[PDB]
Amino acid sequence: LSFELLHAPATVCGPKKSTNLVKNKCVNFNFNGLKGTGVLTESNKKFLPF
Amino acid sequence: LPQGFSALEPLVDLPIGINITRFQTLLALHRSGWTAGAAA
Numbered sequence: 786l787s788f789e790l791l792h793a794p795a796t797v798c799g800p801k802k803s804t805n806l807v808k809n810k811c812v813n814f815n816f817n818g819l820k821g822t823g824v825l826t827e828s829n830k831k832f833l834p835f
Numbered sequence: 836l837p838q839g840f841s842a843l844e845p846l847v848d849l850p851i852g853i854n855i856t857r858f859q860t861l862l863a864l865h866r867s868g869w870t871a872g873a874a875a
């Protein structure tokens with residue numbers, strides 16, 4: 786298995802473990818590279834699909 | 836063209852990495868010569 790490193794987005798990356806989410810408590814979180822800290826609450830915003 | 840406002844939502848994102856300088860369109864034709872619908 787040979788891995789070629791070219792000037793490409795390199796789609797073949799691999800897996801990454803995920804954990805259960807907790808709400809109503811200050812916590813540091815990672816959301817697909819979005820790193821933050823705070824409390825997560827059920828929201829009302831009408832996020833259109835994309 | 837009609838007068839109005841309507842934003843264009845994204846639809847396609849392709850990681851190709853090609854130059855692209857020239858482009859052409861395509862259309863569908865039917866044999867009767869041939870008859871093509873009125874379009875612009």
Ligand SMILES: *[C@@H]1O[C@H](CO)[C@@H](O)[C@H](O)[C@H]1NC(C)=O
Nearest residue numbers: 851852853854855856857858
């Ligand atoms: C893309 O094509 C144009 C027109 O032939 C050319 O001038 C330009 O150098 C090309 N860019 C490349 C090959 O990166």
